[PDB]
Amino acid sequence: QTSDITEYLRKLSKTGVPDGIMQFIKLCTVSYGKVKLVLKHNRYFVESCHPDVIQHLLQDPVIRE
């Protein structure tokens, strides 16, 4: 996630945050995808992370199961 790499950038500057413009941007594209397995089509599972699944239910599951 982008929240983990942000803490490493703040420690490199040594008592100083990277402005603050690019801090709120770290919430756009996430890690999502599809996997083909025994289901002979698609099995929806990506990575062990958790922010990559929360922001998706309000688009595809809301219009079709």
Binding site: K34, V35, R43, Q55, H56, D60
Partner: protein
């Protein structure tokens, strides 16, 4: 990882345009289980790998 199922197979083209319309990006991974022919899935190849300029790009 929370796995799902299949929605009548045909429903697939409409999902590729609704995810990219907002902001997240999709990335269909690997693995498969349909249309097989070359015997199995391990064929024949020597395990002695060479050329470090290709192994580093392979693991990446």
């Amino acid at each position: 990882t929370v796995s799902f199922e299949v929605k009548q197979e045909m429903i697939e083209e409409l999902q590729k345009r609704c995810i990219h319309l907002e902001y997240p990006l999709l990335a269909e991974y690997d693995f498969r289980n349909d249309s097989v022919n070359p015997d199995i899935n391990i064929d024949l190849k020597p395990t002695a790998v060479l050329r470090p300029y290709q192994e580093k790009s392979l693991r990446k």
